[PDB]
Amino acid sequence: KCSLTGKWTNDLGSNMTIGAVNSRGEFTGTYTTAVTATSNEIKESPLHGTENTINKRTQPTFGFTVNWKFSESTTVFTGQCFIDRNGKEVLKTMWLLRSSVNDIGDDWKATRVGINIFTRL
Amino acid sequence: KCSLTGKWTNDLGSNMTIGAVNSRGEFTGTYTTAVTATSNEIKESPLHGTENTINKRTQPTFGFTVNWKFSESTTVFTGQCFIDRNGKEVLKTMWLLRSSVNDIGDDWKATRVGINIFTRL
Amino acid sequence: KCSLTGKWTNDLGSNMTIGAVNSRGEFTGTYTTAVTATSNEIKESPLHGTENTINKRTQPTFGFTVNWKFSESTTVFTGQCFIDRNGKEVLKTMWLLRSSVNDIGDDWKATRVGINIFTRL
Amino acid sequence: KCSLTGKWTNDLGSNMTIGAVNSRGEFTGTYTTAVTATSNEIKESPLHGTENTINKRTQPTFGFTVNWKFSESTTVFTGQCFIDRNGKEVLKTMWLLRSSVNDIGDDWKATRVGINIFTRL
Numbered sequence A, B, C, D: 001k002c003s004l005t006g007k008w009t010n011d012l013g014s015n016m017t018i019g020a021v022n023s024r025g026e027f028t029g030t031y032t033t034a035v036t037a038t039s040n041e042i043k044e045s046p047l048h049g050t051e052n053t054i055n056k057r058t059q060p061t062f063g064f065t066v067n068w069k070f071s072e073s074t075t076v077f078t079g080q081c082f083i084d085r086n087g088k089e090v091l092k093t094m095w096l097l098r099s100s101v102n103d104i105g106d107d108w109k110a111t112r113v114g115i116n117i118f119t120r121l
């Protein structure tokens, strides 16, 4: 089984730690990004999410939200916990980074998208 | 101030209910989608997320994860709570829908993207 | 059937003109955005794209690239030419807006995503 | 300087060839995907795009459309031509894959998103 609990690092150098996943699939953790678009000092930020439990897949999908403590922005990640060919666990994720814009008319420029691959620390 | 607590409906006809947002911005709720890509019967599904409180913004960002209970997939939403120039609250969101695929080699086709506009129900 | 040739306007107030679509599905046009994230004056910009011709569908898929001439960025749009329930032609599109970054290490923050709905102008 | 002309391969094993880029930044080429979600045999397919000419940047942004000849779908790619830290040319791209859906009510599920990294072949 691929499990979200534990420490992870991604291709940008960011780290996150995820606690126990409960029977409903709920989990919390903390996220330390290695990169930022703000001029502010990066601070560890909480994450909250769920892993899908339907049919108790060995490679479950999941999502979580990172509530940045140094920015008005929010990031959500979603992806799947895979067991790779070599037996290593790998999280394949895509994310949306939501900017705070001043007016509803600026909404069009508020959402960035990208990938991250996570492996255990 | 734009508050996430309450009942909302979006442009596809889906509804969600969001509970109280605590002092750390955390909230939970339930989501009833009007549409699905599965043949399975739609079931009410839990959501978990956070709204960003940095700088007491009247129009905060947020994200949440919907842990579908009739599918092995997961959706994450992120967006901003706006006060329309009329004065009504509107959630402008973008989402990622992560399908479950059998093999890590099929990861490339597993993520859909889209928009939803929510207003109070 | 839904056809791409003509003048269109979208939900942001932007306009585009699409020329003749040749037998290979190729087309060119010009794009005048109503909105920008730069400080530079908006300039009309050329677009180039293709319409899918497989099975000669009445509601074809398409894509095009807008080569901005007041910015170092690039936008691609992709979507489908629909005949809506009311009989009106509508382009449902999503886009990626690629910013120029100075360093490959900053690639993660360079891609924005969004939607546009077009109707004939 | 990073130029799009030449033969490339990406992380999924797909190949593409791009011809000369003219003074307006326009180019065409062909694309052989290594993967498909259809049950049709993959066929080499044309691509059409532009690279951004503003400020004649060493690492220009670009976009292009792939007009699949074995599917009713369309993919658009956008990204930046980087000189990476090994002095090698790398295309860092993100894409939108637009499915053909029968009805405008199905539009919400028609767009997939992902990444590709291309290096010279």
Ligand SMILES: O=C(CCCC[C@@H]1SC[C@@H]2NC(=O)N[C@@H]21)NCCc1cc([N+](=O)[O-])ccc1O
Pocket (backbone or CB within 6 Å): A010, A012, A014, A033, A034, A035, A036, A037, A038, A039, A068, A071, A072, A073, A075, A095, A097, A098, A099, A100, A114, A116, C108
């Ligand atoms: O840095 C941040 C927040 C941390 C994001 C880290 C990402 S999450 C995806 C990826 N994966 C990973 O591990 N790290 C990165 N910027 C957003 C705020 C912001 C600032 C400005 N501005 O300063 O002008 C403008 C617009 C804006 O939206």
Ligand SMILES: O=C(CCCC[C@@H]1SC[C@@H]2NC(=O)N[C@@H]21)NCCc1cc([N+](=O)[O-])ccc1O
Pocket (backbone or CB within 6 Å): B010, B012, B014, B033, B034, B035, B036, B037, B038, B039, B068, B071, B072, B073, B075, B095, B097, B098, B099, B100, B114, B116, D108
């Ligand atoms: O349908 C769902 C769950 C509900 C998603 C509702 C969305 S969330 C964004 C939008 N907003 C909103 O309100 N509703 C919609 N998952 C699809 C899984 C799946 C199944 C198959 N399969 O049938 O095997 C094939 C491919 C697949 O991707």
Ligand SMILES: O=C(CCCC[C@@H]1SC[C@@H]2NC(=O)N[C@@H]21)NCCc1cc([N+](=O)[O-])ccc1O
Pocket (backbone or CB within 6 Å): A108, C010, C012, C014, C033, C034, C035, C036, C037, C038, C039, C068, C071, C073, C075, C095, C097, C098, C099, C100, C114, C116
């Ligand atoms: O603004 C543009 C060109 C016009 C794009 C219009 C969009 S295309 C999708 C949507 N639909 C539509 O009709 N109009 C909009 N590029 C921004 C590049 C950029 C510049 C800076 N900067 O240097 O300040 C910072 C961050 C950046 O991302």
Ligand SMILES: O=C(CCCC[C@@H]1SC[C@@H]2NC(=O)N[C@@H]21)NCCc1cc([N+](=O)[O-])ccc1O
Pocket (backbone or CB within 6 Å): B108, D010, D012, D014, D033, D034, D035, D036, D037, D038, D068, D071, D072, D073, D075, D095, D097, D098, D099, D100, D101, D114, D116
């Ligand atoms: O498989 C294709 C064409 C080849 C795309 C290859 C991609 S492009 C991004 C990535 N990078 C790369 O090199 N190869 C891959 N289209 C299927 C999508 C689809 C279409 C419909 N439909 O149109 O009805 C219905 C259901 C569907 O799932």
